[PDB]
Structures are given as C-alpha cells and as structure tokens.
Subunit: 145 residues, 3 copies
C-alpha cells in the first residue's frame, strides 16, 4: 500500500545512516552485499571462528578480487596476517570453504600452497596473497556478515 | 507480494550486519530482544537515566538471570558498580521498576536489601548481585534498548 | 497483513537499538531525520567530500538552527573548525548548496562573508557562526546521512 511504502522508506533511510556512520568511522568495510569487520584481536583459527559466529557472522573468506582486497586492507591496517574461512581437504593442496564447497577464487602467493597436508589453514599476507599454514597461530580476527 | 519479500530480505540482512559489527566490537550486548550498552561514564542515577533516555533507551534493569549476567559482565569489564533501573517503594524493602511495576526477578547479595528506606536506589556488584544504595554515587551508565 | 506488521515491528525495534547504541556512545548525532558523524579527521574540502560520499553520505550542511547547533557541538568537541557543504556562486557574497540550490539558512559571524570571491568555501567556528574561507585548509570532516 501507501503507508507501507512510507514505512519502508524511513527504515531504509535509517539503515543507510547507521551503516554510513559505521563505515565513515572505519568500523566496517562494505563490499557488495558483504560486510567485513574486525575486533582487532589476534587469535588462532578456532578462536576467530567462535568470535565471528558469536557476533552473528562468520570468519571472513574472499570469493572475489574486490572482497580479497577489502580484507587485505584490514590486514595492512592492523599490520598482521588474517586467517581466512577455509580448510584443506583430505587430498593435500585442495581447500574447501567451511560449508564444504570447493574453493573457487584463490590468490596464493607464488609457490603456495605447499605444506602437503601439514598446514590445513590459510593465512592472508598483508599484500593480499595467501599461504597455507597451521591453524594454531595468532592472526587478526576478521569476520564477514 | 514478491518484490516486498525481497526488500525485507535485504533490510533484515543489513540490520544483522550492523548489529553484528556492533557486537563483534563489543559496543553492545544482545540478550533475547534486549540490547545493553554503556558510554563508559560513571555518574549518578539521575544522570544515567538522562543519558539513556537521550539515546532513545532506558537505564538497564535485568528481568532474567541471563539479562542479569549480561549486565554483570559489563560491570566486570569496566570494573565498576552499575545502577539498575529500579527504585524503592514507600514500604522499605520493596522495589519497583521505573514504570511502576513491582520487581519480580531479584539477585540481592546475601543480607540485602537492608537500608530501611534510606537507600532508594539499587547498585549491581561486579559479581552480579545487588545492593540497595543511595542514588547519589557515581556508577557505570548501562542502558538497554 | 498481520505477519508483516510483526516483521516490521522487530525491524524497527532493531534499528532503534543500533541507532541508540551509536548515539549513546557519541558516534553520531541525530537531528530530525538527519544524522551527523565525524571520522575525527582534519582535511581539506575536496578530501572531506570524498570521505563522506564514500561512506554513503554527504559533507554536512545545516539548514536549521538545530542542525547548526548539532554540528557546532561536534566542532566544539573536537575543537576545530568544520567545512560546510556549500560553495560561493559566481556573484561573490552569494553561496549555494552543492546540489546547486541557493542557501536559505545562514549563520555568518558578524561581518561575514567578506572575501569577495577569493574564498569559495565556508567554515564553521566552534561557536557555530560561519566564515567564508579558502577550500584548502584542514578542517574536521563532518558528514550527514
Ligand atoms: C616454515 O614454512 C613457512 O614458510 C613457508 C614459505 O614462506 C610457508 O609456505 C609455510 O606455510 C610456513 O609459513
Ligand atoms: C554503609 O553501608 C554500606 O554497606 C552496606 C553493606 O555492604 C550496604 O548494605 C549499604 O547499602 C551501603 O553500601
Ligand atoms: C585573512 O583573513 C581571515 O580572517 C578574516 C576575518 O577573520 C576572514 O573573513 C577570512 O575569511 C580569513 O579567515
Ligand atoms: Ca605454506
Ligand atoms: Ca544496602
Ligand atoms: Ca571570510
Ligand atoms: Na597443507
Ligand atoms: Na532503602
Ligand atoms: Na569569497
């Protein structure tokens, strides 16, 4: 109806306002329909995952060059590597998103991955390239919503 | 209709994103349908009330164990007592929410309350238990929305 | 319908919560339907404009006394002048909003403006009054959404 179109207008305006404030202050990065954010903490994979799910999101994982660059800027900003939301399959060298799906977009640093199943996790260098590594290091916690 | 179901989807997704960012960064605590937050200030009862109403909320008051524990964690976090949204009735020993209703859930520290009408307000210890006290002390301002 | 009225209720409640948290923590100022916010940075006009548009908003411009006072408080808070969203027309002494429209509400400091076309921009003093100035100074970035 009409009164509905009005309601939805204010609602959408208010959401734009809150998101604008959050982005202006650098509390989050918006890329397409995905929002990235970090609590500034450096912890291991399992810890990061918990923090993200607890906030209603998931450990971040880039699926496009633009998403990858957004995460890289946060890593650069806090000057620390970032654990991405993906783990190695049974067959070494092969990685999958946590939902199980096979990884499509990748940005491995030349030569990577090369840990032969010893390094199940994936960390992002400050330049955005990836490196498979063990899941017990302390990495910047970056979540996506 | 259909286009409406689509609109509402993005709107709900965007709200989840902003709330997720706010919770991930510890700017707020979500418990059920209630959101708690503090400006980090330590002021008296009347001041806190003003700050909260000015932000569009109310001075926090726990009505369930989970809500009580959420507030307690903030008190613990800032290491300071928290004034709760409730005041003593005419009959000492009896307290009511600011809307007038009688207090149901309580978590008095053993022996409390025992100020015999001299202490109209209620402060929360860092362990979550309550103590009736005067309303002129400087306590962490915690609001609920 | 009914289920819709319910959906919209939670949505509106959640927006109030996020906006309340943001205002309680001083991350933004709400005046009517306008929200003001600053990233705390001091840069020139062109830079500010970019930062604001990038966050989904615009460089702030007061159109009412209340809006003017809100911006002034931010300037006072960060103790710095604020560039407003307006520039001088061809005819010196005349200013227009960036959308082109003619400026209606004004709050020039006594004697201002008086740069005779040499100062195309407008800066706000910490007391809220305006002064036309060059657009190359470093001013607090305040955006409106
Ligand atoms: C000890 O090996 C480390 O360095 C190589 C090359 O940098 C990485 O591939 C590996 O995952 C470890 O981070
Ligand atoms: C001086 O009394 C104080 O201590 C007792 C016991 O701790 C409280 O009950 C009371 O409200 C005051 O805080
Ligand atoms: C050098 O002139 C400066 O001071 C006058 C008066 O304060 C302003 O009008 C002008 O824009 C400049 O800021
Ligand atoms: Ca490796
Ligand atoms: Ca007492
Ligand atoms: Ca001037
Ligand atoms: Na490996
Ligand atoms: Na009492
Ligand atoms: Na001028």
């Amino acid at each position: 109806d009409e009164e509905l179109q009005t309601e939805l207008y204010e609602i959408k305006h208010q959401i734009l306002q809150t998101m604008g404030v959050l982005s202006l202050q650098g509390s989050m990065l918006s890329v397409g329909d995905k929002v990235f954010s970090t609590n500034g903490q450096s912890v291991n994979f399992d810890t990061i995952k918990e923090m993200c799910t607890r906030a209603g999101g998931n450990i971040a994982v880039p699926r496009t060059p633009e998403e990858n660059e957004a995460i890289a800027s946060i890593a650069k900003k806090y000057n620390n590597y970032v654990y991405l939301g993906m783990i190695e399959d049974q067959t070494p060298g092969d990685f999958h998103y946590l939902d199980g799906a096979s990884v499509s977009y990748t940005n491995w640093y030349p030569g990577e991955p090369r840990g032969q199943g010893k390094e199940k996790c994936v960390e992002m260098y400050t330049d955005g390239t990836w490196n498979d590594r063990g899941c017990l290091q302390y990495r910047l916690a970056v979540c996506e919503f």
